[PDB]
Design a protein around this ligand. Structure first.
Ligand code: C0Y
Length: 212
């Protein structure tokens, strides 16, 4: 038998309000969610490249810096996998819910004035777009300093962080989107290629689509 430690955290007040706003209001442009995830994946990769200045040991990695997309129609999930820096426990808690973001209220205000959900990234809260198409989000992450963790929230006010004892993934972050029944278009290969070409064409790393 294996064992994992679980922690439940409250979402910062305005993050929780934002998550409600997304989950219960219709928008679409929803496809911008993929660009946000690829962008964050791209930053984690930039950090790996710069960390080398403070830790030359990083250069010794055989791992290729890239982004993989994996649609699974049998399970109704879309997974975005990167080989970036990863996130320690503190990084997950601080950056995925617990700390205030100075752009949160302003964004909820812009949205109420009909601004496009596509502005989410420039307000400092782009990750919560994942909730435009997913009823539950699992974030598997592995950083050099620390253990592998899984973050998870079906929304509802909180999120748990636990030490992941599942399949090791090596350095990086894996975002697993459990799609709402009506968002199945994001499992199709033609739909997937359309939004990448459309929103993530200038990304500096290889992006790969795995089909079937
Ligand atoms: C936080 C989230 C889920 C948006 C995300 C984080 C990373 C990640 O590992 N980060 C740590 C290093 O700095 C960039 C974010 C990579 C992809 C991704 O979608």
């Amino acid at each position: 038998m294996e064992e994992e430690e679980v922690e439940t955290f409250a979402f910062q007040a305005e993050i929780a309000q934002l998550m409600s706003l997304i989950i219960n209001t219709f928008y679409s442009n929803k496809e911008i969610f993929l660009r946000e995830l690829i962008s964050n994946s791209s930053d984690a990769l930039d950090k790996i490249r710069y960390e080398s200045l403070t830790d030359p040991s990083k250069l010794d990695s055989g791992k290729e810096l890239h982004i993989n997309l994996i649609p699974n129609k049998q399970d109704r999930t879309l997974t975005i996998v990167d080989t970036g820096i990863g996130m320690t426990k503190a990084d997950l808690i601080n950056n995925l819910g617990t700390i205030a973001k100075s752009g949160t209220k302003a964004f909820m205000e812009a949205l109420q004035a009909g601004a496009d959900i596509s502005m989410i990234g420039q307000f400092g809260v782009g990750f919560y777009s994942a909730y435009l198409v997913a009823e539950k989000v699992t974030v598997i992450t592995k950083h050099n300093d620390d253990e592998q963790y899984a973050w998870e929230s079906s929304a509802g006010g909180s999120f748990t962080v636990r030490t992941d004892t599942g399949e090791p993934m090596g350095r990086g972050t894996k975002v697993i989107l459990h799609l709402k029944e009506d968002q199945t278009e994001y499992l199709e290969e033609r739909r997937i290629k359309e939004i990448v070409k459309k929103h993530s064409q200038f990304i500096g790393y290889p992006i790969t689509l795995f089909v079937e």
